[PDB]
Amino acid sequence: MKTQVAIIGAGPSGLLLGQLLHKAGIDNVILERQTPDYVLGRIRAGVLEQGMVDLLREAGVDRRMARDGLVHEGVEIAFAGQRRRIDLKRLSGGKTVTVYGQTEVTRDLMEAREACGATTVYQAAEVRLHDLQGERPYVTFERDGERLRLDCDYIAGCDGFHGISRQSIPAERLKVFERVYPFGWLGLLADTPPVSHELIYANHPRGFALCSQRSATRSRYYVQVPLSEKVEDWSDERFWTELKARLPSEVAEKLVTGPSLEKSIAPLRSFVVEPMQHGRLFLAGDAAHIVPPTGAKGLNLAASDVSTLYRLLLKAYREGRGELLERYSAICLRRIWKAERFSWWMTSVLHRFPDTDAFSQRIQQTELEYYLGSEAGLATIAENYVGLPYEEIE
Amino acid sequence: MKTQVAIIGAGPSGLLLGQLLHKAGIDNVILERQTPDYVLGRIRAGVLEQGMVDLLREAGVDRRMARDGLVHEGVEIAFAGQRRRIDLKRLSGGKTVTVYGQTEVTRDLMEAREACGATTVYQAAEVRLHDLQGERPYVTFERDGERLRLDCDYIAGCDGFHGISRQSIPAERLKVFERVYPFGWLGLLADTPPVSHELIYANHPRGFALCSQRSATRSRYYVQVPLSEKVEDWSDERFWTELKARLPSEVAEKLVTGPSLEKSIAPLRSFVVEPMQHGRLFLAGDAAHIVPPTGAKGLNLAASDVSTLYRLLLKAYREGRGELLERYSAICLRRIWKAERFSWWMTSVLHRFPDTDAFSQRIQQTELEYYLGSEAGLATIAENYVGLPYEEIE
Ligand SMILES: Cc1cc2nc3c(=O)[nH]c(=O)nc-3n(C[C@H](O)[C@H](O)[C@H](O)COP(=O)(O)OP(=O)(O)OC[C@H]3O[C@@H](n4cnc5c(N)ncnc54)[C@H](O)[C@@H]3O)c2cc1C
Ligand SMILES: Cc1cc2nc3c(=O)[nH]c(=O)nc-3n(C[C@H](O)[C@H](O)[C@H](O)COP(=O)(O)OP(=O)(O)OC[C@H]3O[C@@H](n4cnc5c(N)ncnc54)[C@H](O)[C@@H]3O)c2cc1C
Ligand SMILES: O=C(O)c1ccc(O)cc1O
């Protein structure tokens, strides 16, 4: 079996990369460990940057998004009883973000991939990578018991945090950066109208709360929760009572509650590996880095890694410029570290930490008061929130 | 013995407050524990904000400053081999800072006080405060052995961190915020031309370094040093070799070194007390709060507390508005917390901390790269550096 670019993983990264490549005439095969239905059952991200919205259009997979996605021009931050709005559009020079669920994007791409007929192998068991430093690397996997080999020129590891690709690079070639936060997010998806037309991030003494949305009739809420909590310990009712307890009263009063469609706990983490490649293997998305969701950068960073890898593969195949591929990590890492810093900052100012002394609490409050009341402070939040510019290469 | 306003301490705060009050017709007596020469021997701050420069003019003590002070329009920050300049003037909307030593300001005020004939009692031993909540508080002290009593309407505690005034307020009425940093600054004053026309803050792997000045022929340099260091362990030569080791080579090459006129180690600290008053006692300057010197806010905060207290005392004496004095702490604390936050931020990004993991180091570097390369980031540094606006009261 043979292809040009082998792609491990069919989440947003793998599908987006694959779609881009296919439209340009570069053969690519995707290997996914799960079934399509399993991948489609993941409720995750909901905020997309301008850059990602353009990459979807470029991949020709934007019809449904242009119809159903909500364009937001601001986000609110509530702390100490007051609600402060950040005008993203005015402060960033006219950029906005688009709210459209990750499940939707994945569904749009999977459909687009099916229609064009490109190769996708689900239930690809025991994927293994070989000859990463040769001229002809290959992948082996098991489809219903028999071991099959797939030959390619390059391998794109788009298998997420627990994927096999990052684990395939000799640990001594890698430099790992990581911070684990002492809390997670308990998220809840409901078929009720969102409480606000825009998102509300909330710093409350009991912990962080976030009011988000998926459509005009579907909502998503999160509340900061310690690592000891179990999802079965949180009935729908306990969640609504806690959410209400963390929001300003004029917001809590108009909250339409309802039974959960999905409920889960996601732990917060920061993680970066350098470099992001090894021989003919290139990492993209969660396979290479993790950000706490506070800044909504995860899926967005995945898009920029992919945007970069794709353009570098094009130069390589169409222009015979195979040497530019060495620049992948340098290019990606610049944007990644700034997104990691924004995510970390957002996380530290909106969440309540366990053993904080009096001084740190006052500083946290003052960070908010300064950044939310200063035109220059608001602009730092805004330009980072909408998304810093993609570097163009060459 | 009787006066209207008793002032404890003859450093910048006490003298400035006293001078302002005197010019407006409000009698005031200053009690200082040391001799004039001792106070004059302290080498400390060198950077003055616009607001402080105007308060000096208002006190009519600005002739020498207008002549010898250096107006700076920018400051440089060096990290990872590169030097980045922050244009304060362009970024803050035209404000600048003025470099004029603290010793000079103190000398100008002491001279001004002498000429106008206001009462200053040096070597005022064992100062004690009494009847703080009555209508007539008083101060007792010892001048060459005999105990004298001074009656007044109000007491301004301008006695610094180790003064008696903060210690005179019942500890249960006070709320203390404090952070101690695991390092200090080893400063050196030399009679050599400064290495740059503007200040250079430096983040280097060996620790922080700062190149400052006092005049066109006098310089002041600092290098971050751990708490274990003793000044007698640092010969002039050891200092120059370390300073040079922490600066970019094109800067180190042109450094004119020389024997020290003064050399000392100042530990870094953050400290705030709330409220800043008790009955007829009002705290000002270091008596109420400490900031690490990284943002040059100490003497500047002292000026704003004093500017506020003075205007409130004027309303009280001239207008019979004695009730406005209750607003002192609320007014002062707003500016103080923002200055404390700026100082903390500057400190955390320019200094090397002892037990930092890989992630934090990368974030520290990225903080600098973001704030120094973003127009909005640069503006946050600039408006804070020149000094946020003084609140006007009423
Ligand atoms: C559980 C979780 C919750 C999250 N929640 C949020 C959230 O609420 N908000 C938010 O803003 N962001 C959230 N994120 C982050 C955001 O969803 C991601 O950054 C985004 O999904 C990254 O896409 P990806 O393609 O890189 O990774 P993924 O979506 O993880 O896709 C990787 C894919 O590769 C497959 N794969 C794994 N191992 C192998 C293998 N050995 N062989 C073959 N295929 C393999 C997996 O089955 C998976 O389909 C979350 C991430 C996770 C892991
Ligand atoms: C040792 C030290 C080093 C510093 N170094 C720097 C530096 O390098 N850079 C910088 O930016 N800032 C520095 N600062 C901070 C800056 O100098 C101050 O914020 C500024 O001096 C505050 O002025 P003040 O009048 O409030 O206090 P001070 O200048 O401390 O004056 C308070 C005065 O009150 C007197 N006093 C004390 N106790 C009594 C008493 N019991 N009775 C009567 N009088 C009393 C003292 O003798 C003193 O004269 C430093 C502060 C200190 C303490
Ligand atoms: O799921 C969301 O809608 C969502 C929105 C904002 C954010 O920062 C993180 C999130 O997961």
Ligand SMILES: O=C(O)c1ccc(O)cc1O
């Ligand atoms: O003494 C200085 O000149 C000086 C300058 C800048 C600064 O932040 C701190 C300082 O003590």
Ligand SMILES: [Br-]
């Ligand atoms: Br979703």
Ligand SMILES: [Br-]
């Ligand atoms: Br995220």
Ligand SMILES: [Br-]
């Ligand atoms: Br000085």
Ligand SMILES: [Br-]
């Ligand atoms: Br200071």
